[PDB]
């Protein structure tokens, strides 16, 4: 109904305004922290190095910024456009995740990126639906074995369907939300909260880019970097299936 | 179809590897240059400041990089707010749309925690509204097309081709309104190039949301109504991008 959709517009609008109020309340008081830190680093350096004027340090910092802004990395193997990192970057596109922790610097890069995505995303969506159906099949089939137990326990077939859905997501959650977060905690030296934040930002395809796992491989742990890709693939499909059915439940309501 | 799933997987895999090759070819050289420039900047600073060890300068740079990475601005030493009501509103929008530009990061654990639940609840809610607007927007377009379609049928063009021509007009005008119109708008408003603007538009409507480009984010602009109003476009554009792709899928099936 057109009347109802106008209502829905207004609701969402309120969900946004309410969100805005909360983020502002939680984040505005720390808007300036990074400047402060930068200034502290400057002031500290000046005090140690009397041969340096504040102004000269300033120019150094600008020049450093320009280089970092072109993709340079502070050095003390780190190429974001070597084959593996470019592979990853392409992934971030067709998944629509779009971390963007590494920006394209060339107009050709941008141009190509347009067509790469237009063709890549739907192509990926297809594979994702495919893996979603196949993964759900495997899950629902395994859960079917546990369902056998509930039906013998004379639990109503309607609730058994519900228990299995709860199980369906709960086990996925365990495998694709919980398991990875614990993995990343140890691997990335993130906090539990940072890791879940990452995971969920990732699987929702929000892809902020403030946290990113698998862009580069780790020596002394080869299986890491692929498993992450494998994970994203499987996790996105699990997440998709949940959204389609929760989308499914919602639209009829 | 298990056979097809494996074929599809292999295809995508090749789409990625092919993408990787191209991005590396287009971007690595610029990156390798920036890395060189960073090192030139260091070497130049050492030659001018004998009180400074390379290793000490390295630490300074790492520290500067971290701060810039956290959104510090090289140019000033310290009015405008990234978390004012309008920008926070916008930020919330970037979540539920799953676009996730991320040009301003959350710094607080509360911010992150809240962001998780905000999205889990926000995205499906939005998906619903989007489907709604997609159907309603397509309806309104289809109704408007009908009157001009009357003219084609009288001109004795077959009903099968008139349907095709109308689709062309259907998308061409949508494209005009939601792709072309905005890109021309942003070109003038953001001082981007045409190519940058289309890049932005498309990165946006695909929900990739890299965050290298973000409309309204510019600090200098005195443009309060601008940034949410752009969201008005985002809403309309996303749904159209969606609804059309949905109906295309149905026609294919």
């Amino acid at each position: 109904r057109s009347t109802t959709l106008l209502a829905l517009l207004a609701l969402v609008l309120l969900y946004l305004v309410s969100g805005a109020l909360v983020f502002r309340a939680l984040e505005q008081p720390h808007e300036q922290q990074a400047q402060r830190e930068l200034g502290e680093v400057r002031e500290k350096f000046l005090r140690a190095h009397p041969c340096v004027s504040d102004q000269e340090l300033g120019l150094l910092i600008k020049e450093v910024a320009d280089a970092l802004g072109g993709g340079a990395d502070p050095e003390t193997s780190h190429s974001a456009w070597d084959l593996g990192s470019a592979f990853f970057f392409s992934g971030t596109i067709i998944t629509t995740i779009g971390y963007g922790n590494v920006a394209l610097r060339t107009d050709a890069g941008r141009l190509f990126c347009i067509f790469y995505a237009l063709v890549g995303i739907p192509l990926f969506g297809i594979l994702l639906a495919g893996v979603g159906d196949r993964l759900g099949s495997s899950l629902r089939h395994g859960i079917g074995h546990i369902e056998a137990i509930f039906l013998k326990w004379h639990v109503p077939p309607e609730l058994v369907r519900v228990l299995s859905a709860m199980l369906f997501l709960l086990i996925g959650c365990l495998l694709f939300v919980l398991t990875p977060t614990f993995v990343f905690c140890y691997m990335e030296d993130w906090s539990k909260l940072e890791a879940i934040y990452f995971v969920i930002v990732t699987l929702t395809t929000v892809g902020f880019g403030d946290y990113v796992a698998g862009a580069d491989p780790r020596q002394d742990s080869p299986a890491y970097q692929p498993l992450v890709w494998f994970w994203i693939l499987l996790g996105l499909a699990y997440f998709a299936s949940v959204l389609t059915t929760i989308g499914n439940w919602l639209r009829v309501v | 179809r298990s056979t097809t799933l494996l074929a599809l997987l292999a295809l995508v895999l090749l789409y990625l590897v092919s993408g990787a090759l191209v991005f590396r070819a287009l971007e690595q050289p610029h990156e390798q240059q920036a890395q060189r420039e960073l090192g030139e900047v260091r070497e130049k600073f050492l030659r001018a400041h004998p009180c400074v060890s390379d290793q000490e300068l390295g630490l300074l740079i790492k520290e500067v990089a971290d701060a810039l990475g956290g959104g510090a601005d090289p140019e000033t030493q310290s009015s405008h707010s990234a978390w004012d009501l309008g920008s926070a509103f916008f930020f919330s929008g970037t979540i539920i749309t799953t676009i996730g530009y991320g040009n301003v990061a959350l710094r607080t654990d509360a911010g992150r925690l809240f962001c998780i639940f905000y999205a889990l609840v926000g995205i499906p809610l939005f998906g619903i509204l989007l489907a709604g607007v997609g159907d309603r927007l397509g309806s309104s377009l289809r109704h408007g097309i009908g009157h001009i379609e009357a003219i084609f049928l009288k001109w004795h063009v077959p009903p099968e081709l008139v349907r095709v021509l109308s689709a062309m007009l259907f998308l061409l005008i949508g494209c005009l309104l939601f792709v072309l119109t905005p890109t021309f708008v942003f070109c003038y408003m953001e001082d981007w190039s045409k190519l940058e603007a289309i890049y932005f538009v498309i990165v946006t409507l695909t929900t990739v949301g890299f965050g290298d480009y973000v409309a309204g984010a510019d600090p200098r602009q005195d443009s309060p109504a601008y940034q949410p109003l752009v969201w008005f476009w985002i809403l309309l554009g996303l749904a159209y991008f969606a609804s059309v792709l949905t109906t295309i899928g149905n026609w294919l099936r």
Epitope: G39, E43, L46, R47, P50, C51, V52, E56 | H49, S78
Partner: antibody, heavy 116, light 107 residues
Framework: EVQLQQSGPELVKPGASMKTSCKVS????????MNWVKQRHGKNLEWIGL????????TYNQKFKGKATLTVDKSSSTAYMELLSLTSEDSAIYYC?????????WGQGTTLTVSS | QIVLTQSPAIMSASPGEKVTMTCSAS?????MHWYQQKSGTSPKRWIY???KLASGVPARFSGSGSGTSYSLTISSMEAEDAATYYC?????????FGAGAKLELKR
């Protein structure tokens, strides 16, 4: 005993320019930033600008951008300020002082008198 | 650009009296420095980085403050303390000075 020895008082006609000096001893000239400061009779101190004796780099107060030119002679560890197009408002005491965050040593000052 | 206000511009103290002069900044700085000047002669770094004493300085002097408000204090005035004290900042280029506070002996 660090010491910044400024040259003597100078008297010049309006319009002329004038160059004044500050010879440092007791430390290494090129290791520290040199500044100059203006004090018009018994009033606020005004930073004119700085030079880095080692690199030649200079920056100036906007107020003094056109007015003052800082230079150094490394061999004689001496710093120079030139003032240009002098007007009556330039009559003051001028100091060389050392520092990149606080001004830890000052010359004894030199008095400039601009008058017809 | 950053403006430093010292007020009042004049004050007076008997010997033994405690003396406090303040420096308020148009916007925040991380550190404040102070100079002592006696007529006839150049300023002397007196206190730097807010609360560090320069070499010569006797203990009766102290400094404190943060953000936008800083102070210089004499626990117990002495005769040789009569002078003009200036604050200055360099957390933002260009460095700037207060307009000074003149401290005379009471009688």
């Amino acid at each position: 005993e660090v010491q910044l020895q400024q040259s003597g008082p100078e008297l010049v006609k309006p319009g002329a320019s004038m160059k004044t000096s500050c010879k440092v001893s007791g430390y290494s000239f090129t290791g520290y930033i040199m500044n100059w400061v203006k004090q018009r009779h018994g009033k606020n101190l005004e930073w004119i600008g700085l030079i880095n004796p080692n690199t030649g780099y200079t920056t100036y107060n906007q107020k003094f951008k056109g007015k003052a030119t800082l230079t150094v002679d490394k061999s004689s560890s001496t710093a120079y300020m030139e003032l240009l197009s002098l007007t009556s408002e330039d009559s003051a005491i001028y100091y060389c002082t050392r520092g990149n965050y606080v001004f830890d040593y000052w010359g004894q000052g030199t008095t400039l008198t601009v008058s017809s | 650009q950053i403006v430093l206000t010292q007020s009042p511009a004049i004050m007076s103290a008997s010997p033994g009296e405690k003396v406090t002069m303040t420096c308020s900044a148009s916007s925040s700085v991380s550190y404040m420095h102070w100079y002592q000047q006696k007529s006839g002669t150049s300023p002397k770094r007196w206190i730097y980085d807010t609360s560090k004493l320069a070499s010569g300085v006797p203990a009766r002097f102290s400094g404190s403050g943060s953000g936008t408000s800083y102070s210089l204090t004499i626990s117990s005035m002495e005769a040789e303390d009569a002078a003009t004290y200036y604050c200055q900042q360099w957390s933002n280029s260009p460095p700037t000075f207060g307009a000074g506070a003149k401290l005379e002996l009471k009688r």
